[PDB]
Write a protein that binds this DNA or RNA. Structure first.
Lengths: 79, 206, 98, 64, 150, 100
RNA sequence: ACUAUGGUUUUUAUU
RNA sequence: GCGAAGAACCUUACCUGGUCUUGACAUCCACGGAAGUUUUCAGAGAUGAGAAUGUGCCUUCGGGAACCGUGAGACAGGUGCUGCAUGGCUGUCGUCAGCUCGUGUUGUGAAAUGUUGGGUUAAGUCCCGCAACGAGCGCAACCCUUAUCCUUUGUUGCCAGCGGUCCGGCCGGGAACUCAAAGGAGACUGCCAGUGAUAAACUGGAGGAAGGUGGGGAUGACGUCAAGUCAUCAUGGCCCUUACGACCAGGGCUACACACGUGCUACAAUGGCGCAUACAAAGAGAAGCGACCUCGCGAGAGCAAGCGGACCUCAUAAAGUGCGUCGUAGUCCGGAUUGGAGUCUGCAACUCGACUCCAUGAAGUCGGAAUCGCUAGUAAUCGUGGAUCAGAAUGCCACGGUG
């Protein structure tokens, strides 16, 4: 949502979005971006999101935009 | 501890205090840190120089102190300028240039901190002390006391129990609100263990 | 109507200016307006007596408000600047008024 | 009369009436002397006791 | 432990004209508004008086005189056995108790305002009537369970 | 309290001297977002998070008298667990008793 | 006294 | 509702990938250079490279100093463990009045004695008296404070008396009364009379700021529990030290296989609903408290006055009261976990903040034996503020209203 006029942008991931323009076939990249948002001008590459002990591979659909990367990488094993 | 301490509420009302200065809320903790560190420095340099108290004042862009001793000669030292070497340390601790002076304290064997400095040696050396305690009491009652007590705690008779040994005269009440008690705590270390000695003096009300 | 009320925070530091607050008034002019009763604020703080648990007892402390009006009774600038950049006591704050 | 609650205003007025009757006559300065109408009462509130919210109703907090 | 600062006395009520009514507006006191005391006086004095008591000088006092607690029971030993032993009621409690118990039945009527719903059960006390008179009658039955001692 | 924590306690304002202590008087004028869609200043707010282990909020003081960050009294420069003993000794500017 | 009436809690480092 | 008046990062023990090893903070033998200021790249970053630019004013072969960085050996570091090791801190029976010692007497002796007895008190409190006589610690007393008096001072307060008057504390200004301090006085069963072992002690009257512990508090005998605390420290053991130390980027500490100790609001109608209204303190306030006013249903946002608080603001206290209204019902009662939608702050509110507007109207018909608090401004019962801090308290503490 918003954030402080127009979407939140997170820079250590963005340096790859700037090169995947021009995207293609690569392994899922380790990312520590958990508060980063899935807006259509920041998405373009395969990624594995940190959960507090591992990085897990995540994928998104065309019908979702109001969400953050951490919600695709839950930190609980439950119990 | 139990049973009211003269450094407690007895000093918290109607008595004067040795540090007299002010500070703003944006640096208050470094003002209290320096007050402690300058007095902790000076009381250990002068540990054998018959010092009793040190007052602290903070004039604009300065700090000023007075040292109360029963021997001004050993504190002012060679040439009468041996206190100047202390300024260079306390001005680093305070962050401001330091002023120093001294004052002669009268009747030395009537101050609990200078009476403790007449008896702690006897426990450190492990020598007979019951007449040293008789002297400590009789000299204070000769100089101007209205009561005095001294009490040892540790290693007495080579036991393992928390036992004490004392000498008193004139009665020193602690539960009295107005009695203005002078109270020193002292301790000595030996190859047979540590030994504590407490000294309490009474001179009159208010 | 310009005022210059003096506020103290240690009662022993305003006990050093008790005469000089009258001498300043007799040295700057002739009318004396230093003294004034004013409402006192207790400025209280209350604290626990045990470092751990035992919230069954608390003890009370104070700093209070110590206030003197001083005031200006002289129109001349060589005296107004002496009252607006005045010295009387230590550990103080000054309330300028219109 | 000015200030405070109307039930306290009434109490200050009985005092004022007794002090005014004491200005009126040398016999009223006697006949009202011990009537208790100038003798200030004490329902003085006790120092607030930790850790109670109000007055003396003690909270349970005990089993275990 | 007999060391006490209470032990208060009463004086005749200035508007009810009686020592037997001196506590009538002061019982079971709550939240200090004292709105029962202002709403019970004069405004029920000719609507409680319908069939009991001779003239206004007794036609309200009758509701504290026609109903009587006579005995109070508590367990005590006598001669070799335990009994519910009664103690007979004295003039200082004879009239100033039975109006403390009608507050239960007055809360089973759906009847409006505290003064008027209380006075409607007090209107029955003038003829020795009441719903669940336990605190008078169940102690009287227990004070007939033994009638001779020692 | 660890000596590493006693060091963080001062290091967390010793570089704020250069980044915040003479800049954050403009926290609403220079350090606050104003532009929609097309920012014209145009990336300068990231410079507020450029220094390491240091921010205007991380300027926390903890407590200098005792190893507890909570239970501090800023207007007297002391911890509530030592403030009585210090106020009985008279060390505190202006704060006193009678009694209650 | 009409209270009709009654059992446990480890030996082992300690008060 | 405890340590903790706050918690994305940080805090922090717990925990997972990356990562340094004389250490983020030192001392001993040594040791490099303006303290500073900008800027680039790999990478999640720590970290590792640099690329450039600052040399004062003195002056001796010199060299200053903030802050950073180094050559050997000892070591440094540790919410790691240990209050059956020690000093300090601190709990409660209890603010209960009790605990004991020197010497004589008795007993073979551990010990007994005095402290027991007899009056009296809140009280080994005060007296009397004995083979016991004398004595310390605590008790009570100082001080804080309340009903009064002596005394001094007065705006931003209050506003009568005096002159002038936007006829108004408004301009000059002053103490009617009162708000409002800052400093001192003094109570002793003292006086009178009755009881009592005319001792001690108890009970009325005279006159009181207050009587006969005036009221309310502080203090914590000897000890018990070898009382909780190395989570403030001090500091002896037991251990870790290419690590259990120190860090970067993230899990947590606000899990859930399932159990306690309390608390609040209702189960009505001296209760709710709506409209208009009486009378309080106390407290905080320059990245603060925010008036007047506009916008939205509203949080809140905006224009923007005052200013270090007797001043302007937070902020028209609530119950109480009148005037209207609803009815004996699972109700106009009751408001709960999900649902719909916004507002604010910040590196960031899915998990993990707080406020606001809409929809639902559940469960609740007085609790299972059973259990608990309070005696006068007490029980009752209704409001108000503040610390932290970028970001909020059904808590905690304090202050009134009514009784």
């Amino acid at each position: 949502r918003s954030l402080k006029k127009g979407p939140f942008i997170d820079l250590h991931l963005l340096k790859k979005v700037e090169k995947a323009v021009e995207s293609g076939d690569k392994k899922p990249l380790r990312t520590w971006s958990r508060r980063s948002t899935i807006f259509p001008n920041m998405i373009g590459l395969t990624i594995a999101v940190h959960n507090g002990r591992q990085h897990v591979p995540v994928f998104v659909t065309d019908e979702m935009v109001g969400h953050k990367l951490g919600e695709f990488a839950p930190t609980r094993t439950y119990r | 501890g139990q049973k009211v301490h003269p450094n407690g509420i007895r000093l918290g009302i109607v008595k004067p205090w040795n540090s007299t200065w002010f500070a703003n809320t944006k640096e208050f903790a470094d003002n209290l840190d320096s007050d402690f560190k300058v007095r902790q420095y000076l009381t250990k340099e002068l540990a054998k120089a018959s010092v009793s108290r040190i007052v602290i004042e903070r004039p604009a862009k300065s700090i000023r102190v007075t040292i109360h001793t029963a021997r001004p000669g050993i504190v002012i030292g060679k040439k009468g300028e041996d206190v100047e070497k202390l300024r260079k340390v306390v001005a680093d601790i305070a962050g401001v240039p330091a002023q120093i002076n001294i004052a002669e304290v009268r009747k030395p064997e009537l101050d609990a901190k200078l009476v403790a400095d007449s008896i702690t040696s006897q426990l450190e050396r492990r020598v007979m002390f019951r007449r040293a305690m008789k002297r400590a009491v009789q000299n204070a009652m000769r100089l101007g006391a209205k009561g005095i007590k001294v009490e040892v705690s540790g290693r007495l008779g080579g036991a393992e129990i928390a036992r004490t040994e004392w000498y008193r005269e004139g009665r020193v009440p602690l539960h009295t609100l107005r009695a203005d008690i002078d109270y020193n705590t002292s301790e000595a270390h030996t190859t047979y263990g540590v030994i504590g000695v407490k000294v309490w003096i009474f001179k009159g009300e208010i | 109507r310009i005022r210059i009320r003096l506020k103290a925070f240690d009662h022993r530091l305003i006990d050093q200016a008790t005469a000089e607050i009258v001498e300043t008034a007799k040295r700057t002019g002739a009318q004396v307006r230093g003294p004034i009763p004013l409402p006192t604020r207790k400025e209280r703080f209350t604290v626990l007596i045990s470092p751990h648990v035992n919230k069954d007892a608390r003890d009370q402390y104070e700093i209070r408000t110590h206030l003197r009006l001083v005031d200006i009774v002289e129109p001349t600038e060589k005296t107004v600047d002496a009252l607006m950049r005045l010295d009387l006591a230590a550990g103080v704050d000054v309330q300028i008024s219109l | 009369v000015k200030g405070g609650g109307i039930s306290g205003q009434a109490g200050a007025i009985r005092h004022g009436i007794t002090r005014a009757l004491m200005e009126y006559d040398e016999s009223l300065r006697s006949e009202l002397r011990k009537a208790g109408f100038v003798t200030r009462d004490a329902r003085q509130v006790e120092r607030k006791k930790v850790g109670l919210r109000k007055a003396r109703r003690r909270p349970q907090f005990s089993k275990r | 432990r007999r060391r006490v600062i209470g032990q208060r006395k009463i004086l005749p009520d200035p508007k009810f004209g009686s020592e037997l009514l001196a506590k009538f507006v002061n019982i079971l006191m709550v939240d200090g508004k004292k709105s029962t005391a202002e709403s019970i006086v004069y405004s029920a004095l000719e609507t409680l008086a319908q069939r009991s008591g001779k003239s206004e000088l007794e036609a309200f006092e009758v509701a504290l005189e026609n109903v009587r607690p006579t005995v109070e029971v508590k367990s005590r030993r006598v001669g070799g056995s335990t009994y519910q032993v009664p103690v007979e009621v004295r003039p200082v409690r004879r009239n100033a108790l039975a109006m403390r118990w009608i507050v239960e039945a007055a809360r089973k009527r759906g009847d409006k305002s505290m003064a008027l719903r209380l006075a409607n059960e007090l209107s029955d006390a003038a003829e020795n009537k009441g719903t669940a008179v336990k605190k008078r009658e169940d102690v009287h039955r227990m004070a007939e369970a033994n009638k001779a001692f020692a | 309290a660890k000596q590493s924590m006693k060091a963080r306690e001062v290091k967390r304002v010793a570089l704020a001297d250069k980044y915040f202590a003479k800049r954050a008087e403009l926290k609403a004028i220079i350090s606050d977002v104003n532009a929609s869609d097309e920012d014209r200043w145009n990336a300068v707010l990231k410079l507020q998070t450029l220094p390491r282990d240091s921010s205007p909020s991380r300027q926390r003081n903890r407590c200098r008298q005792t190893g507890r960050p909570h239970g501090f009294l800023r207007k007297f420069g002391l911890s509530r667990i030592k403030v009585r003993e210090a106020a009985m000794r008279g060390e505190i500017p202006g704060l006193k008793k009678a009694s209650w």
